[PDB]
Amino acid sequence: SHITINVMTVIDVAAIIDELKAQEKKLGQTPDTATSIGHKYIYMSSDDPRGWSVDPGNITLNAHVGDTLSFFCASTSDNSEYAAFIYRLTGGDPHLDPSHVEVIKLQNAAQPTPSNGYPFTTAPVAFSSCDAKVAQQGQAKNFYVWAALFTLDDSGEKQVLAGYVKWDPTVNVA
Amino acid sequence: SHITINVMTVIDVAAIIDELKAQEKKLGQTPDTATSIGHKYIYMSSDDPRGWSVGNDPGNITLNAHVGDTLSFFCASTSDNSEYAAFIYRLTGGDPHLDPSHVEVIKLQNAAQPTPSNGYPFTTAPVAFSSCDAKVAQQGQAKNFYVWAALFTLDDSGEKQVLAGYVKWDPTVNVA
Ligand SMILES: [Ca+2]
Ligand SMILES: [Ca+2]
Ligand SMILES: [Ca+2]
Ligand SMILES: [Ca+2]
Ligand SMILES: [Ca+2]
Ligand SMILES: [Ca+2]
Ligand SMILES: [Cl-]
Ligand SMILES: [Cl-]
């Protein structure tokens, strides 16, 4: 029958921001004017039980038409310094059909406690993912993942919006 | 010229738990009794400014680092800890290549958070993170180095995550 496949993207948020600095380009400041970036700093993995394999910006998934791809992301610090959140997927036609972002709030998500991690506790945490339906096997040509990027301010306690990016990962469905 | 290098591990928590029970192996229920697992379901990335490459095999990574550099290890499930979840709480071994420190639990008063139902406008709220360091003591490939994590599942109510158990794996880390 039909399954959901997690596609997790680790993002080098620092590299992307510092790249743009040196590249004389600037970061988009509205969700619609997200800066289009390479897939140089985009590292995908999956839980695909049907099997899968991965260069950066690329992934090959065994998926049937009717399967759902569920896109998750995080910075290389697991959003504890720089942070990234996906809010949108567009395109993919005819291979993928994006849905709208799904915000999950676990009222009791597992959380580490100081100063040893264990014993672990629970507390409210919010997460985001965005799904895409597999509509046709092949390499999706025109598929964009959109994410908001954040940095840690000098207080070391608050993360602030740095801007919006989008990238065009190469997703092969097989 | 010393720098901190992030090592992010994505973990297929489901596959690790399934294969363990399909293999008759108990899942460790105490932090000190974590079950040694293969590194088949371990996928590492980095932010290493000096460059890096990711193993044709999972459980491998090659990082450009110098002695005195610090590796900081982070992790999450394939669903970003929103269904199954994972948290590093310990690193052991590594002699003479890596020298682990003890776990650090980061609490951000105002971590960035998505809001329903559009994600944006984002908000902020308290969230906890864990990571653990190892100092680069000698270039080469660490053989005796273990990352330890607590694994969690999402119960039937879909609102609470519960402790499944503890595991440790021995990633192949090449410092070059
Ligand atoms: Ca909920
Ligand atoms: Ca401690
Ligand atoms: Ca995370
Ligand atoms: Ca030590
Ligand atoms: Ca703090
Ligand atoms: Ca919506
Ligand atoms: Cl669209
Ligand atoms: Cl040790």
> Where do the structural domains in chain A lie, given as residue ranges?
1-174
Does CATH place domain A1-174 in 3.30.160.60? no
Please say whether the beta carbons of B32 and B59 come within 8 A: no
Rounded distance between C-alpha atoms, residue B139 and residue B65, angstroms: 8
B1-176: CATH architecture: Sandwich (2.60)
Between A and B, how many residue pairs show a Cβ–Cβ distance under 8 A? 195
Phi and psi at A24, nearest 5°, equal: 65, 20
How close is the Cα of A156 to the center of ligand 5, in Å? 6
Indicate yes or no: CB of B78 within 8 angstroms of CB of A8. yes
Give strand pairing partners of B149. B88, B167
Backbone angles phi, psi at B152, to 5 degrees: -135, 155
User: What tokens does B143 get?
Assistant: 């053989």
Contact B118 A129 (CB under 8 A): no
Q: Dihedral of CA B133/B135/B140/B146: which sign?
A: negative
CA distance linking residue A68 with residue A81, whole number of Å: 30
Q: Best interface-test mutation with A: which of B61, B90, B127 has the largest number of A CBs within 10 A? A: B127
Q: Is B7 helix (H, G, I), strand (E, B) or coil?
A: strand
User: What span, in angstroms and rounded, lies between the C-alpha atoms of B36 and B14?
Assistant: 16
What is the Cα A81 distance to its own chain's centre? 16
What technique solved it?
A: X-ray
- Chain A's closest residue to B4, CA to CA, is A77
The beta strands (E) that lie in chain B are given as 4-11, 35-37, 42-46, 52-54, 60-63, 70-77, 85-92, 98-100, 104-115, 119-136, 140-142, 146-154, 161-169, 172-175
A49 preceded by a cis bond (ω within 30 of 0): no
Neighbours of B142 (CB within 10 A): 24
DSSP code string of B32-81? GGPEEE-STTEEEEE--TT-EEE-SSTTEEEE---TT-EEEEEEEETTTT
Resolution (Å) of this entry: 2.0
Neighbouring C-beta atoms of residue A38, cutoff 10 Å: 12
Query: Which residue from B125, B2, B11 is spatially nearest to B68, judged by alpha carbons?
Result: B2
Q: Are A165 and A132 in contact (CB under 8 A)?
A: no
**Distance between CA atoms of residues B27 and B33, nearest Å:** 9
Q: b/e string for B63-79 if b means 16 or more Cβ within 10 A? A: bbbeeebbbbbbbbbbb
Q: Is A105 among the annotated ligand-binding positions?
A: yes
B86, B80, B143, B90: which is closest to B114 by C-alpha? B80
Q: In sequence order, what are the residues at sequence separation of 6 or more whose Cβ sits closer than 8 angstroms to the Cβ of residue B13?
A: B77, B78, B84, B85, B86, B151, B152, B153, B164
Token representation of residue B157: 């109510």
- Looking at the DSSP bridge assignments, the partners of residue B60 are B172
